[PDB]
């Protein structure tokens, strides 16, 4: 989750999101190199009574400042596309959990072995236990075994939603009659929070997502208690 006065990305919970942090660092570093440079050359251009209003040859400098940006772009593209093709992969996962968007809640379906399905609604604000976070807590969390490659299949039963967990670097749009797949791999236990990321109507702000990542042992027992 986000803390007060946060500037950057949520602390990474998965190796994908680690790679995005480092990649974001790479890219933002270049973005600083260039925004600084333009600012400097503007102030350079505007601070000298020296004039030269006659014509200037165009076809010479225009090489420097077409080629350099293209070499700079490849320096961005390569790492970017590596991380993309990594996000797909032959992953071969232990477990497959479906999520279904509704106006306005998520339902989860663990159907590998038994027909385990539950609704996961936002705790209202008036009903919060002391220390429980406004707009983020759910009645029934998504319990998942840690350090396991899980398959998430996202869909909707009404309109577009979008299943996001920044902490894990997951955003997959929920589309009716479509089964979108994303893989999940929490490197640690914990609670890890997300919110609908497509405008689904009146209550788009208020259908959040909580991952409770415990170990396999405690997952098995939870599954059987939710049937």
């Amino acid at each position: 989750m986000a803390y007060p006065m946060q500037l950057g990305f949520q602390d990474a919970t998965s190796p994908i999101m680690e790679e995005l942090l480092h990649f974001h660092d790479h890219t933002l570093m270049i973005v600083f190199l260039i925004s600084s440079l333009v600012l400097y050359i503007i102030s350079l251009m505007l601070t000298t009574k020296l004039t030269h209003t006659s014509t200037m040859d165009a076809q010479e400098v225009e090489t420097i400042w077409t080629i350099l940006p293209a070499i700079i772009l490849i320096l961005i593209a390569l790492p970017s596309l590596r991380i993309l093709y990594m996000m797909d992969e032959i992953n071969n996962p232990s477990l497959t959990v479906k999520t279904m968007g509704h106006q306005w809640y998520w339902s989860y379906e663990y159907t590998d072995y038994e027909d385990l399905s539950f609704d996961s609604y936002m705790i209202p604000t008036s009903e919060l236990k002391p220390g429980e976070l406004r707009l983020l807590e759910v009645d029934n969390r998504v319990v998942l075994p840690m350090e396991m490659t899980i398959r998430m299949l996202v869909s909707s039963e009404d309109v577009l939603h979008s299943w996001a967990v920044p902490s894990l670097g997951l955003k997959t749009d929920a589309i009716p009659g479509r089964l979108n797949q994303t893989t999940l791999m929490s490197s640690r236990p914990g609670l890890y929070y997300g919110q609908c990321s497509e405008i689904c109507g009146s209550n788009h702000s208020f259908m959040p997502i909580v991952l409770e990542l415990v170990p396999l042992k405690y997952f098995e027992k939870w599954s059987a208690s939710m049937l």
Partner: protein, 514 residues
């Protein structure tokens, strides 16, 4: 006379003046919505107590500001005034069809305002994606009225695009090559061509949406074998070219302003600036699905769409560096317009860079539908499109009106406007990384400080808008008439005096073939 002059105009100048009044008005509508967005978000809790209304206000805000403020002022307003004057044409190719381009917009606008009045309004976001936008989650006439509002604006812009092209292609001096027309005209011809190819697919897209909602087609409804994704492809096929349509006339005006206020006879690298605007125009048509990086298209398609989006940086860069090069060794006049132009150059670049961050389908996973995307586009639109509009306006106001603005007041107006937009939009960068979604009427407590600061910024920008009005008033109140204008040798538009006569180039320019 009032009627024959102002309802039946066949005069590019008068029609231009009509467009400027439309945009200025619509602009106030657009602005008030923008404050209603930030008042709701300015503290934790729900202010309107009805989130469906918040979604309507957001949706209206983007339609108004895109189609009824930025597009009319730049293409309708500056375009009709200047294009004919800059190429020594007595009017536009179709002076009467041109009047219909203008008169379609009031009704177009009425229909949008109407959509928010009836039922619970179109709380869809300006993308209008089904099924939310469909006849089940948005039953009633709100969305249908939004669709028609768009149809009318669409036809209007298509008819104007035909006019600008035809005018620019066919009504130059016979001696005059295309490679001899100023950069602003180029910019409008390439914007005209974008409108021509893009707006017809929008019309197709939102018709198929109309018929889903009213004629029991299933273009987009999986029940009959439809696909919500078909719509996003069609929408965004137009959608991306539209963002370029919105900035391209801005590049024209800056090119002109930066050149004029440097006391150059011409912008650095003129053929480069053409090549760049044709390049942007062209790459703008092959990049659209960077808007669809989370819908579950192939990793290969996502790789392509990433790699293709990145190349736009090259041509766009040529322009940034050509402007800085135009400044080089200038006799700089620190006019208000020049500050607007310099403000743009830097603030557009920042906005252009956050766009390059978003280009990565890997990172766009974590950034899509967050305030990073809002931050990116408010930089290139509120500090890009709007800074070019302001610059253009203060620079050419005396050509239109025959009166001068108070430079000191205009300089104050820039300084207030510059602080506001930056305190408003910069922090939203953090909101994005920190994972605050778009289209939220309320936020986890953590997000409070930046929303509080962002919203205060909005109120500053408003004191700038209210002042600009007064400034326009003071110029008309005081009536200081233009005598003299520098650099008419290389700015034909000024050459007929301020303001120019009803009919200019009764007798065309004399230009030698040599």
């Amino acid at each position: 006379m009032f009627i024959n002059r102002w309802l039946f105009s066949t005069n590019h100048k008068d029609i231009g003046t009509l467009y400027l009044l439309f945009g200025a008005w619509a602009g106030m509508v657009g602005t008030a919505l923008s404050l209603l967005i930030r008042a709701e978000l300015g503290q934790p809790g729900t202010l309107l107590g009805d989130d469906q209304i918040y979604n309507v206000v957001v949706t209206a805000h983007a339609f108004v500001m895109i189609f009824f403020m930025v597009m009319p002022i730049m293409i309708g307003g500056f375009g009709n005034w200047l294009v004919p004057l800059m190429i020594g044409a007595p009017d536009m190719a179709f002076p009467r069809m041109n009047n219909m381009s203008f008169w379609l917009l009031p009704p177009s606008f009425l229909l949008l305002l109407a959509s928010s009045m009836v039922e619970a309004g179109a709380g869809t976001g300006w993308t209008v994606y089904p099924p939310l936008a469909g006849n089940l989650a948005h039953a009633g006439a709100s969305v249908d009225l939004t669709i028609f509002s768009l149809h009318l604006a669409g036809v209007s812009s298509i008819l104007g695009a035909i006019n600008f092209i035809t005018t620019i292609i066919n009504m130059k001096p016979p001696a005059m090559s295309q490679y001899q027309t100023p950069l602003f005209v180029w910019s409008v011809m390439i914007t005209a061509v974008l409108l021509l190819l893009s707006l017809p697919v929008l019309a197709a897209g939102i018709t198929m949406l109309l018929t889903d909602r009213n004629l029991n087609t299933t273009f987009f409804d999986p029940a009959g074998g439809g696909d919500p994704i078909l719509y996003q492809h069609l929408f965004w096929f137009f959608g991306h070219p539209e963002v370029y349509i919105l900035i391209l006339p801005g590049f024209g005006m800056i090119s002109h302003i930066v050149t004029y206020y440097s006391g150059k006879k011409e912008p650095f690298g003129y053929m480069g600036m053409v090549w760049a605007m044709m390049s942007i125009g062209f790459l703008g048509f092959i990049v659209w699905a960077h808007h669809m990086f989370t819908v579950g298209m192939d990793v290969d398609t996502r790789a392509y769409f990433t790699s293709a989006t990145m190349i736009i940086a090259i041509p766009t860069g040529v322009k940034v560096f050509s402007w800085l090069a135009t400044l080089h060794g200038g006799n700089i006049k620190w006019s208000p317009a020049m500050m607007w132009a310099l403000g743009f150059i830097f603030l557009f670049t920042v906005g252009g860079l956050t766009g390059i961050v978003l280009a990565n389908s890997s990172l766009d996973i974590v950034l899509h539908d967050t305030y990073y995307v809002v931050a990116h586009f408010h930089y290139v639109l509120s500090m890009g499109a709007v800074f070019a509009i302001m610059g253009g306006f203060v620079h050419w106001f005396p050509l239109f009106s025959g009166y001068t603005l108070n430079d000191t007041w205009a300089k104050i107006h820039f300084a207030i406007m510059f602080v506001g937009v930056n305190m408003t939009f910069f922090p939203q960068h953090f909101l994005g990384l920190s994972g605050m979604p778009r289209r939220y009427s309320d936020y986890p407590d953590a997000y409070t400080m930046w929303n509080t600061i962002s919203s205060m910024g909005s109120f500053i920008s408003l004191t700038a808008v209210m002042l600009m009005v007064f400034i326009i008033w003071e110029a008309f109140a005081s009536k200081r008439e233009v005598l003299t204008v520098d650099l008419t040798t290389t700015n034909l538009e000024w050459l007929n005096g301020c303001p120019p006569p009803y009919h200019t180039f009764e007798e065309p320019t004399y230009v030698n073939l040599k």
